[model samples]
Target chain A: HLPQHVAIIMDGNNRFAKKNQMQKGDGHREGKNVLDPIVEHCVKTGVRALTVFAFSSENWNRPQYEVDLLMKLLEETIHEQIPRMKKFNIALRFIGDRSRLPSHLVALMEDAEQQTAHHDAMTLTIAVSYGGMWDIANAAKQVAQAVSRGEIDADQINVDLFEKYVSLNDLPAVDLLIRTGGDFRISNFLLWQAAYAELYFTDTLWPEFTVEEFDHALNVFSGRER
Target chain B: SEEYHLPQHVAIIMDGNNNVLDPIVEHCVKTGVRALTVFAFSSENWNRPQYEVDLLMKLLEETIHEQIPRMKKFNIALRFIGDRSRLPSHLVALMEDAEQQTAHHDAMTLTIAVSYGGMWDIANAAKQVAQAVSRGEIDADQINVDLFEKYVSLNDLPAVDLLIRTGGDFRISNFLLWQAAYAELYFTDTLWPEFTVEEFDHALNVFSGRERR
Candidate 1:
């Protein structure tokens, strides 16, 4: 009951691509296919919030064509998922540095979020271009800027206000964190939220993971005493 | 306040014994630390070469043999940490016998963590929780930090007040990751083997003087 918020690192899309011998876009499409049903199951399981690492700052290092296609596929997926999201009454939100996102895609994401802002069925948070250090640094920058503008005092502020500057300030601290693809390390995601969170790791690739597998993870969560 | 008040519980990393055992024993006796917990070996240590592993085992046996007299003289209680299932049968037997023999000593408690690592600790704890849940021993809603601590190696041990890591390493190396969440960390440039009582005293002095928010 205490593990109210859950965060995930959906890794190994490229590896999934190579394994299937499909184009990069096709791999993402498959990954998207895997996530759609999982999201529905989560709502039924009584999880309050789900935050996913969709894109990372380091992901921009890829070839231009792949980044462009990934962005395109993301926009298309959001557009397609909105109706289902609305029907499910799930509130959608985005977290991360969005200034660099393409104008049209940002507009699409914002519109989807606004359309579902009032819904309370469950919240699905997608983190794009995100990094834990960047989040802390960005929050620090905001507080510093506020100080420079004489809007707030540096001495009076604390961790609570500092958290308000993070991209997803409304999100709760992570309860149980899962990393698929058999990796032991955290790979720079959700450093602050995971300070006290229980960790679950598995060897299943992103695309191959199913709803039952997700339930297994939740079972592991429910089984834990922490 | 008296400057020489011994810590109620002192958690140690207990490393590089061949070089610092003499000094470490001297300091522990002088510092008035009532309880000392040291991490000696971990599950990850199995990755080391066979020769080194064998050497460490032999050294541990020798060290314990030498320290037995000092331990008896000081009336210290000794305990082992970590899941002993991973250790060799002889070592496990030796450890159990030692614990049984020293069950009544009360002067100082020495906890040595052999084949113990934090990640494995968390995983094993989780496994126990999962097993309990499957058996309906406890409800899922009862899980929390305090309950979780019941399964860790140092269950209900006073939270590490000051974590000191010798050797030039700046990172915690994943030792007691959860327990040290809010602990004040002190890193020393002095290698483990060469660490002195004076150096340890300095560390304790720094720890006692610092304020925690």
Candidate 2:
């Protein structure tokens, strides 16, 4: 009914937290916390790979306090989820610019991937500080670096080889991309991977997305012909 | 009239099957369009009532059958793409036969996409190519846009030049996913069934007058 890989733009954390009368950090924490369960559900429901847009390159422009809190929350989430992820046999991967991330957060992400490297049930990709333009920039940098190192012939480069420079090069392309929180546009999630992704946008906020709502998405996906 | 400015590939989201098909086929022939891909149905349309789905299928069958003579006379080859596996068996058979019958036609090519969606198309095609690479049938590092396009259902077609949707929809509605990346999108409020050839020609004329990006 659909492709093996699905990408999602998990937007609307601050608004959900504000509406729920919680601190912004609380909303971010809860959203981050839901990551493991959602990945598990996708795997159990027969999806082989999933990629989620957790943070964007543009999001770094937020206030200092919020940025600091989000970073802390991301580290804490990774620390807590690693064990649960191991239990589910999921392989965790990180995509996007790690250079801008806090050293501790980057260490935690690397540790999580290292610990989950042997897991085989599913692959969960968390994109942090990601943007399409940034992705293209990073790919270009890799190509330039490779040429400097004399690793490959520059004249032979094409889209497929150029894609290897992109983060998570081993992962499959996006099949069904669902953006929650009523946003019609992709908002710079997986620009290259989502070139051909089927999109499902629902008004339902991220915090309130229940398992049943998830099932509804699957139903819609199953009914889709291509 | 401008040399080297012809539309590379043209895709029409042909809507309004409630209208007559003869005029549409006749206009297509008269225009000498080299290639056209029409978004005939989408996965979302399955939500419509069973009766409506049946009627649309019947209409599609009748349209294809009726257009055969014009297609033949114009040397146009007809192809139906998308997830045909999900379609009813009879329609699948009809589509296969149509492809086989029109295989020799060389002047033009027409593609009808039933039960097709843009993202799904890319994912599926990419999966096959990726799998082939993984199996060592082809080198993954060597895959290029031209080679990858061969795996796409609409292979050999030119890049889409102009995209027009008659239902006044502002978005692409998942049509021509990869091909429409650079196309000029035109949206109109005219109901698909009521859109006349004059409107199509007008759209083309407007397109011809505009400067390319």
Candidate 3:
């Protein structure tokens, strides 16, 4: 059976750039281009939700130029992909801290989310400026707020209830987590939701991971007892 | 071994009765590792057949009684990490006695996770935090990652550096969620009972070769 939810860590863009002898920014540009097809593939396969890590909170530690380029790429991608998303009946949502994002980019994200809000065929979540710790902390803060407001007793909080406040709370938990570029660590991606996710690590960089390889991963997942 | 960078903390998810326990502990002591933690039983394990669960408890009691003298000789402090409310009272007493007896040992720390789950740990911590908030000892606004972590289990131990799972499972299965945030995961097909020091070394080698950044 195909996994109902698939999450991916799109890594090694810079390594891909170095391998191809291209600029680091070019690697990200290529990485961004690969997402549309991946989303399309997931939608076609009847996968309910597909979440991809685009920019991690730690990525800001990189050179300022690279950071700026990533933000630019994200803004551009949203603008360009909104129409395609609507056509494919894919609902788009951004999961992360939007406080630090530039207003224009945040605006673009909000606009895209609203435009595709009605589509129910599939949900594509883009995790930008996100970390698993950040997600949990964010949820914790919300729960704290509710406690302070007397909206709910502090003792009422439990696993199932606490999960309602997490990112991707409405979606099924991740079934398979694929990390490209051969990393063995989750790198702070979906820590809470990936409690039982089957991890798939591959050496192929994000840009080089093709539709065929995605199917291969699905095949491996289907064979697992789960 | 000098060529390898050993993990300061190594955690394992034991699948079944693993005869590899003594050798693995010996290897850890010989390799200068600081702490080792193993998941012997999860809260979910109770869902299995009653006979299996009873046998596991019996094995656990026997292992504690059998290993205490050896642990003392090796100067290894022992502790159990998990909820004990539902555990058999006699077994709980045994665990408490073992922990107190080994409390003074500091050469290494060994922890066993029986009736444990990562989600349960986190929720338990959150409950504590909420209780604190209700008591007015700390305001809700003051709650953050660092503050929240102080309430979780295993807060004293270093963050897990390497997490090894035997029996070829790629899932974390709700084990050490907060502690293993950045752990280098090592999964293997060898069942827990068949694992050896060589397999342990293989995992450590993999951890040493990986780039952390």
Candidate 4:
């Protein structure tokens, strides 16, 4: 059975660039291009939600030019994909800390979310500037604030209530987490949501990952017991 | 062989069916690893058939009894991390005795997680913090990440560097949630009983090669 929610950590753009003898930015550009087909595949496969790691909070440590190029690419891609999202009935959502993002990019993200607000064919979430620990800590801080205001007692804080404050509280927990570039770590991605997610790791880089590779992952997930 | 920095803290998810004790202890000693923590039984394991649970409890008790002398000889400190309220009185007594007997040893620390769940640990910690706040012992504002962690189990030890799950599962299954926030995870299809020292070394090799950013 196809998992209702599929989350992927798209890695190895730099390696892919090296392998292709292209500039580093070329890999990211190609990586973004690959997402359209993957999203189309998800819609066709009846997958309800698809979340991908676009950029992480730690990615800021990369070179200035690379970071700037990624931001630019994200803006351009969002603008390019908004109409296509509407056509495909895909609702767009962004999860992460938005405070550090450029105002223009943030505006674009908001516009994309609003433009696709009514579409429900499939929900596509982009995790930018996100970390699992940051998500948990953010939720904890909110819970603390609520307790201070006497809006809720601290004693009332439990896993069920605590989860309501985290990201993706509106969506189902991740059923399968796929990480490319042969990495076996979660890298602080969706820790709470992936508690029981069947993990799939592939050596195929983001730019080279195709619909067939994704189907292979789903096949492996189906064979797992849980 | 490429030299590699060994994991100072290694955590394992034991599936009750695996007799991983002798190899695990030997590997830790041989590799000079500082600590080893294993999930021997979970709070959820009680849902299984009564006979199975009883057999596991017996296995745990007997292992502790039989390993205490060897642990003492090897200077391995033993501790059990879990909620012991529901455990049988005799087994609890045995566990406590084993802990005290090996308290002075420091060559390695072996922790057993029985009747444990990561969410339960977090909630229990939060409950304690809340109780303290309600009594005016501490303000709600004082509860931050560092403070919150102090209430979870194994706060004294280093954060887990590597987490290995046997029996082919790819989930954390409610193990040490807070501590394993950034740990490198290793999953194997080999069942617990079948996992060998060579397999353990393979996991360590994989961990050594990983680049944690």
- The DockQ values of the predictions, listed in order, are 0.02, 0.04, 0.64, 0.44
Better of 2 and 4 by lDDT: 4
lDDT of 4 by residue, B92-167 (tens): 9999999999888889899999888776676667666766666677776676666777887888888888999888
Interface alpha-carbon RMSD, every candidate? 18.2, 9.9, 1.3, 2.4
- Which sequence of candidate numbers ranks them by DockQ, best first? 3, 4, 2, 1
For model 1, the DockQ equals: 0.02
**How many steric clashes does model 2 contain?**
2
Ten contiguous residues with the weakest lDDT in model 4 chain A: A136-145
Candidate with the greatest DockQ versus the true structure: 3
lDDT of 4 by residue, A1-226 (tens): 7888999999988889999899768889888988898899999889999999898878888899998998998899889889889889999999988988999899999999998989999999999888776676666656766766778787667778778877888989899999898666788788778777878888899999999889888877777332
lDDT of 1 by residue, B81-107 (tens): 776766778877888877777868877
Model 4 clash pairs? none
In model 4, which runs have C-alpha deviations exceeding 4 angstroms? A224-226, B16-19, B89-97, B100-104, B125-152, B209-213
lDDT of 2 by residue, A6-109 (tens): 77777677778888899756767777765666777887887888888878887899898888887777777687778878888888888888889988788889
Tens-place lDDT digits, model 2, residues B1-213: 463343545677765344433465456566665777778888677789999989989977887787777677777898887777677898888888888889888777778888887655654555565555445576555554556667657767776776777765333366676666556555577878788777776666556664321
Please write out the lDDT profile of model 1 over residues A19-71, one tens digit for every residue.
88987567677877777887888788778788888887777887988789779
Colliding pairs, model 3: none
Best by TM-score: 3
Give the docking tier of candidate 3.
medium
- What residue pairs are clashing in model 1? B41-B115
